[PDB]
RNA sequence: CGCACGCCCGGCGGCGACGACCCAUUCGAACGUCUGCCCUAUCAACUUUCGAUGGUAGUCGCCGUGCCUACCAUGGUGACCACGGGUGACGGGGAAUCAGGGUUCGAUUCCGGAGAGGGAGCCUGAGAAACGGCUACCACAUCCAAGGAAGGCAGCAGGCGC
RNA sequence: GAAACUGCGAAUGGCUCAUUAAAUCAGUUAUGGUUCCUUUGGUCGCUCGACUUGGAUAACUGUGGUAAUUCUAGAGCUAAU
């Protein structure tokens, strides 16, 4: 059907090839997955050798990684902002590999607070009134507190990250082919990558 | 071709089988196994053509379905099972044991061995490997995977394995000054002492071999088998002892034995 | 695809000039003296000799 | 329009031929696998649904 | 200077967001006695298809032509000359076969006429299968 | 699932058959590298904004790749014969003829390719774009209670036509 | 031990040369850029949380359709690697 072959298109010299055989199967080709954002929907494609290949047609969750301290959590994709290849893949917000998405910052914040015993986001004059957040931020023995005061030293977050946390949504880049593995796994944008992409989103936006 | 091929025509059959033309159209396409299609000896060929125990492929079928023939200490009820190099074929009811090692010419000789020698075989290691728990792995020339080997054995050595346990006893390192039988190319069956190895990064490394009588010949490294340390082979050899004398010498020896018979 | 030979070969060569008096006379003297049945049986022995002489020549040209 | 009429729990069945129009006039514009009362078919078929 | 294309250009193996308190570079010697040149180690360019600072393995053939054209993007046309031997007339005939070959920005200045050594790699584009591995400046070319 | 039936206080296990994610192996397959083909100039310029040659990121595929999307770059080939046209052209191992060179043939039993009336599309399976598989249309064509049913000899024989 | 369900094979073999002019094909190398039934050899108490479970279907039994085909609808009974 959808042919994936070299013999259908002109030689290096601009001379036409006359096809010496009809379409073979291994010269295969199938329609594009076109993965949207919605409730989990995955169809299975049986491929050469009797192996499987999962078509994610809708996805909500995704395994994203805060790379600077090896904090990976399953979060909830909310929307797409910028795609490098094509900008109709933004309009009809398709999930493809290496597209910029926004994710829920809540599992990263929860880990950050429970690891450093310091607040992240939570704007000045934050009423922490359930006060089991204050349990996670206070009430230790002696030597355990020494370990936690030792560690809070190197919890200096990049201001670019700290804004996104306080807004409540982080930028991430999809590192897995979602149309072939049925997964929207990626990494949270940081440093020079983040400054590059934040310029690109603002510039395009206007 | 829309899939794997199952018929092998008699003219396409490997030449070392010495199959006659006017018998049929086909030869026995060897069933998949440890050795390659091209370089094996199918059990029907060895049993019917070489030994002359059977006359037809149906007679060979009638033998091999009584569990008589044992290849490498396991019963093989497949008449086109590929029996290749170094393989040990023990028939119990007759009380006879054969090791398939090459004639001095490019074919398999029918070399009888003793009950005590038909208990092991030499395997050329093909690739060393680490498994899924830092467990080291060997792969041999006859498709055997041996795990937890000796930590010195490397990619071109020879190992002596036992045909009950399938475990490594002793091994011969691939060095200069070690006996090697040549198991591929023009020099097929030539025994000699390794003189040199010539390294070519990206290409096939050629290895110089010295025969007993000062005959020097090269072969690609792949087609060499270290069968002994020094001049001492760890197996028994056919009559000739892998020299491959010239055609003028073979004539002289033939008509010497002829005229002596008279 | 059958189990047959197809390996046949002519064992004689007809001479170029069909009516040379000296050649007719030569061949009849062989036919009569030895009681051959026809010319072919003489041309056959010419051809076998011609092959042997060719193989001798082709080895004699090779350096000793 | 013959009727292949089978009783399951009995496990017996019979071909019963029809040539009264009015009997069949109910069955029309139904779909397959719907229970329909045979009270109308004949007086031996009374309180029956097929 | 770099990152002209819409997607962010990085050597994808090296990680550049290690928390602290120069950028590192990934490269390799590509075997067969080729000196991984100085620009590979001390450049700041990004290339998928550089044999030194990229994901291509050199294996198979090692051929050599003369640089003919340098008018396409990180690619050049070399011209390979040989003598084909006709059998009937016991003489040769001068033939040629020019191939599109991938030039890394590693080799900073090559001039049309320079001698190139090329290593076979996987197919890089429609017609590109070879990589420039060392350049030998054409006869003289000092001034 | 099948044969052998066992070894102590209701205790107590060997040969095989079948099956299985992964690994190597065997059989391959697939897409690439370098060099190689007949006649033709009454075929000298050809290819490209609907892929032509490259770059980046995707899509798809068993995988590498303009294979195909989007945005960029102006490239690729050519008197060393490109582009186009012709073949009573499937390629090769080989065959006939020969002093030495050579010329002509190779549908034809071995290897490789392509096709099953002409194109196209697919199910099942490890492997098929299969035709002694299915689904359409084009050409032909069989059987009809006229509503419908069924086709594929360039398999072995055999019939018409040529 | 017929039938039927299941498993495997039917992609090989055979036939012809219409296509096809760097295409096919031949020698030479690459997969460090892939898939692989079958075979042979490894693996298969590596995991920390029932002395054998379930509801259908065929062959079979019976009731039928249209002129027709290797068309098959309906009912009752029963299996599994």
Curated annotation (Swiss-Prot), chain B:
The modification N6-acetyllysine is found at residue 232. Pfam families: 40S_S4_C, KOW, Ribosomal_S4e, RS4NT. GO terms for biological process: translation. GO terms for cellular component: cytosolic ribosome; cytosolic small ribosomal subunit; nucleolus. InterPro entries: KOW, Rib_uL2_dom2, Ribosomal_eS4, Ribosomal_eS4_C, Ribosomal_eS4_central_region, Ribosomal_eS4_central_sf, Ribosomal_eS4_KOW, Ribosomal_eS4_N. Its main location: cytoplasm. GO terms for molecular function: rRNA binding; structural constituent of ribosome. There is a cross-link at residue 229 (Glycyl lysine isopeptide (Lys-Gly) (interchain with G-Cter in SUMO2)). It comes from the Eukaryota. Transmembrane segments: none annotated. It is found in: Cytoplasm; Nucleus, Nucleolus. The keyword Electron transport does not apply. Gene3D superfamilies: 2.30.30.30, 2.40.50.740, RNA-binding S4 domain. Keywords: Acetylation, Cytoplasm, Isopeptide bond, Nucleus, Ribonucleoprotein, Ribosomal protein, RNA-binding, rRNA-binding, Ubl conjugation. Residues 41-103 form the S4 RNA-binding domain. Belongs to the eukaryotic ribosomal protein eS4 family. Component of the small ribosomal subunit. Part of the small subunit (SSU) processome, composed of more than 70 proteins and the RNA chaperone small nucleolar RNA (snoRNA) U3. Identified in a IGF2BP1-dependent mRNP granule complex containing untranslated mRNAs. HAMAP family: Ribosomal_eS4. This is Small ribosomal subunit protein eS4.
From Swiss-Prot, chain C:
It comes from the Eukaryota. It is found in: Cytoplasm; Nucleus, Nucleolus. Component of the small ribosomal subunit. Identified in a IGF2BP1-dependent mRNP granule complex containing untranslated mRNAs. Part of the small subunit (SSU) processome, composed of more than 70 proteins and the RNA chaperone small nucleolar RNA (snoRNA) U3. Component of the small ribosomal subunit. The ribosome is a large ribonucleoprotein complex responsible for the synthesis of proteins in the cell. Part of the small subunit (SSU) processome, first precursor of the small eukaryotic ribosomal subunit. During the assembly of the SSU processome in the nucleolus, many ribosome biogenesis factors, an RNA chaperone and ribosomal proteins associate with the nascent pre-rRNA and work in concert to generate RNA folding, modifications, rearrangements and cleavage as well as targeted degradation of pre-ribosomal RNA by the RNA exosome. Belongs to the universal ribosomal protein uS4 family. This is Small ribosomal subunit protein uS4. It comes from Oryctolagus cuniculus.
Curated annotation (Swiss-Prot), chain D:
The modification ADP-ribosyl glutamic acid is found at residue 35. There is a cross-link at residue 14 (Glycyl lysine isopeptide (Lys-Gly) (interchain with G-Cter in SUMO2)). Ribosomal protein S6 is the major substrate of protein kinases in eukaryote ribosomes. The phosphorylation is stimulated by growth factors, tumor promoting agents, and mitogens. It is dephosphorylated at growth arrest. It is found in: Cytoplasm; Nucleus, Nucleolus. Component of the small ribosomal subunit. Part of the small subunit (SSU) processome, composed of more than 70 proteins and the RNA chaperone small nucleolar RNA (snoRNA) U3. Belongs to the eukaryotic ribosomal protein eS6 family. Component of the 40S small ribosomal subunit. Plays an important role in controlling cell growth and proliferation through the selective translation of particular classes of mRNA. Part of the small subunit (SSU) processome, first precursor of the small eukaryotic ribosomal subunit. This is Small ribosomal subunit protein eS6. It comes from Oryctolagus cuniculus. The chain holds residues 1 to 50 of 249 of the full protein.
Swiss-Prot record, chain E:
Its main location: cytoplasm. Keywords: Acetylation, Citrullination, Cytoplasm, Lipoprotein, Methylation, Nucleus, Palmitate, Phosphoprotein, Ribonucleoprotein, Ribosomal protein, RNA-binding, rRNA-binding. One of its GO terms (cellular component) is cytosolic ribosome. It is found in: Cytoplasm; Nucleus, Nucleolus. Citrullinated by PADI4. A lipid is attached at residue 50 (S-palmitoyl cysteine). This is Small ribosomal subunit protein uS17.
């Amino acid at each position: 059907g959808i042919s994936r072959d070299n013999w259908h298109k002109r030689r290096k010299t601009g001379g036409k090839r006359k096809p010496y055989h009809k379409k073979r199967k291994y010269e295969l080709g199938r329609p594009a997955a076109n993965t949207k954002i919605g409730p989990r929907r995955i169809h299975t494609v049986r491929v050469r050798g009797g192996n499987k290949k999962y078509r994610a047609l809708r996805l909500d969750v995704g395994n994203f990684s805060w790379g600077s301290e090896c904090c990976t959590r399953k979060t909830r994709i909310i929307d797409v902002v910028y795609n490098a290849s094509n900008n109709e893949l933004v309009r009809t917000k398709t999930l493809v590999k290496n597209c910029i998405v926004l994710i829920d910052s809540t599992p990263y914040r929860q880990w950050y607070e429970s690891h450093y015993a310091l607040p992240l986001g939570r704007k000045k004059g934050a009423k922490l009134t359930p006060e089991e957040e204050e349990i996670l931020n206070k009430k230790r023995s002696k030597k355990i507190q020494k370990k936690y005061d030792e560690r809070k030293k190197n919890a200096k977050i990049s201001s670019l990250l700290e804004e996104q946390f306080q807004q409540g949504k982080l930028l991430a880049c999809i590192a897995s082919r979602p149309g072939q593995c049925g997964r929207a796994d990626g990494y949270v944008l940081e440093g020079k990558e983040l400054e590059f992409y934040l310029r690109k989103i603002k510039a395009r936006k206007g | 071709a829309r899939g794997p091929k199952k018929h092998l025509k008699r003219v396409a059959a490997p030449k070392h089988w010495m199959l006659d033309k006017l018998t049929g159209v086909f030869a026995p396409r060897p069933s998949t196994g440890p050795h390659k299609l091209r370089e094996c000896l199918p059990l029907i060929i060895f049993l019917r053509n070489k030994l002359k125990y059977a006359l037809t492929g149906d007679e060979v079928k009638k033998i091999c379905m009584q569990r008589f023939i044992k290849i490498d200490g396991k019963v093989r009820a497949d008449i086109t099972y590929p029996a290749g190099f170094m393989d040990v074929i023990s028939i119990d009811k007759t009380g006879e044991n054969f090791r398939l090692i090459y004639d001095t010419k490019g074919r398999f000789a029918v070399h009888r061995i003793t009950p005590e020698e038909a208990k092991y075989k030499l395997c050329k290691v093909r690739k060393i490997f680490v498994g899924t728990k830092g467990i080291p792995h060997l792969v041999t020339h006859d498709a055997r995977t041996i795990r937890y080997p000796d930590p010195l054995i490397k990619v071109n050595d020879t190992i002596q394995i036992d045909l009950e346990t399938g475990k490594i006893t002793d091994f011969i390192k691939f060095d200069t000054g070690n006996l090697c039988m040549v198991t591929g190319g023009a020099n097929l069956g030539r025994i000699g002492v390794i003189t040199n190895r010539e390294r070519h990064p990206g290409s096939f490394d050629v290895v110089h071999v010295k025969d007993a009588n000062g005959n020097s010949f090269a072969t690609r490294l792949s087609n060499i088998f270290v069968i002994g340390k020094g001049n001492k082979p760890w197996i028994s050899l056919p009559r000739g002892k892998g020299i491959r004398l010239t055609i003028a010498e073979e004539r002289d020896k033939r008509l010497a034995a002829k005229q002596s018979s008279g | 695809p059958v189990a047959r030979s197809w390996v046949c070969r002519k064992t004689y060569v007809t001479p170029r000039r069909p009516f040379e008096k000296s050649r007719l006379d030569q061949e009849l003297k062989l036919i009569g003296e030895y009681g051959l049945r026809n010319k072919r049986e003489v041309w056959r022995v010419k051809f076998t000799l011609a092959k042997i002489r060719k193989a001798a020549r082709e080895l004699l040209t090779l350096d000793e | 329009m013959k009727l292949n009429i089978s009783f399951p729990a009995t496990g017996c069945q019979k071909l019963i031929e029809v040539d009264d129009e009015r009997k069949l006039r109910t069955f029309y514009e139904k779909r397959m696998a719907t229970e329909v009362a045979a009270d109308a078919l004949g007086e031996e078929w009374k309180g029956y649904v097929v | 200077d770099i990152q002209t294309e819409r997607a962010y250009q990085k050597q994808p193996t090296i990680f550049q967001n290690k928390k602290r308190v120069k950028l590192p570079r990934y490269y390799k010697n590509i075997g067969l006695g080729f000196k991984t040149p100085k620009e590979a180690i001390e450049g700041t360019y990004i290339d998928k298809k550089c044999p030194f600072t990229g994901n291509v393995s050199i294996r198979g053939r090692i051929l050599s032509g003369v640089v003919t054209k340098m008018k396409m993007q990180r690619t050049i046309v070399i011209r390979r000359d040989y003598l084909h031997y006709i059998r009937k007339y016991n003489r040769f005939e001068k033939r040629h076969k020019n191939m599109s070959v991938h030039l890394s920005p590693c080799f900073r200045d090559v001039q049309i006429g320079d001698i190139v050594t090329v290593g076979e790699c996987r197919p890089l584009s429609k017609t590109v299968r070879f990589n420039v591995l060392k350049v030998t400046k054409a006869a003289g070319t000092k001034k």
